[PDB]
Amino acid sequence: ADEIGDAAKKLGDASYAFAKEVDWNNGIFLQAPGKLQPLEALKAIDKMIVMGAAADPKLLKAAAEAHHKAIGSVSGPNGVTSRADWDSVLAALGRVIASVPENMVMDVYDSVSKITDPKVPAYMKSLVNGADAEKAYEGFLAFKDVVKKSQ
């Protein structure tokens, strides 16, 4: 057990209602988040590859295993994993984030932002309960503070 695991439980309390509202079987998630921009997108994928290569290999393995288990508990009309597997995935990914320098994480974020059209977040939010999305995000802000203290 660790503090990221405890924080994941709190993040799940804040975000699971939102996760249940997302239609995970929507084909839109295969599309570019805006206009297709292969050269800029490759720069974002490169930042991700740098981060993956730097991440703790055991924690990457554990995060993959948590997603396999999560796939097994998918149910209902939107393809949402169980609450326990949601929290599991959250914690395992927080451990991966904490295992690399903050700059690597920010480089991924900035590089993906550069290819994400400004309309995309609001369009995604419009498909779910807005107050549940805001609680999820408020949860995320608390969670990342715990992740940073482990990083």
Ligand X SMILES: CC(=O)O[C@H]1CC(C)(C)C(=C=C/C(C)=C/C=C/C=C/C=C(C)/C=C2C=C(/C=C/[C@@]34O[C@]3(C)C[C@@H](O)CC4(C)C)C(=O)O/2)[C@](C)(O)C1
3-state SS string over 52-66? HHHCCHHHHHHHHHH
- Six token digits for residue 139: 């949860």
- Among ligand J7Z, a second copy, ligand CLA, none, residue 27 binds (CB under 5-8 Å by kind): a second copy
Site size toward ligand J7Z, by CB under 6 A: 14
Q: Is 104 in the site for ligand CLA (CB under 6 A)?
A: no
Q: State the DSSP H helix or E strand holding residue 113, giving kind and residue range, or none if neither.
A: helix 102-113
Tell me if 150 contacts ligand J7Z by CB under 6 A.
Answer: no
Smaller CB distance to a second copy: residue 79 or 130?
Answer: 79
Q: How far is the CB of 7 from ligand J7Z (least distance, A)?
A: 17
Identity of the residue, 60 or 120, whose beta carbon is nearer to ligand J7Z in the bound complex:
120
CB of 87 to ligand CLA, least distance (A): 10
Contacts for 82-87: CB closer than 8 Å, 24+ residues apart? 83/12, 83/16, 86/12, 86/15, 86/16, 86/19, 87/8, 87/9, 87/11, 87/12
Query: How far is 91 from 144, CA to CA, in rounded Å?
Result: 11
Q: Smaller CB distance to ligand J7Z: residue 116 or 129?
A: 116
Q: How far apart are CA 109 and CA 104, in angstroms?
A: 9
Torsion sign (Cα): 132, 136, 141, 143: positive
Which does residue 65 bind out of ligand X, a second copy, ligand CLA, none, counting CB within 5 to 8 angstroms by kind?
Answer: a second copy
Burial class, 8, CB count within 10 angstroms (exposed 0-12 / middle 13-18 / buried 19+): buried
Please give the residue ranges that form the binding site for ligand X (CB under 6 A).
Answer: 19, 22, 24-25, 27-34, 36, 38, 41-42, 45, 48-49, 51-53, 60-61, 64, 67, 70-71, 74, 79-81, 86, 89-90, 93-94, 97, 102, 105-106, 108-109, 117, 119-125, 128, 133-134, 137, 141, 143-144, 147-148, 151
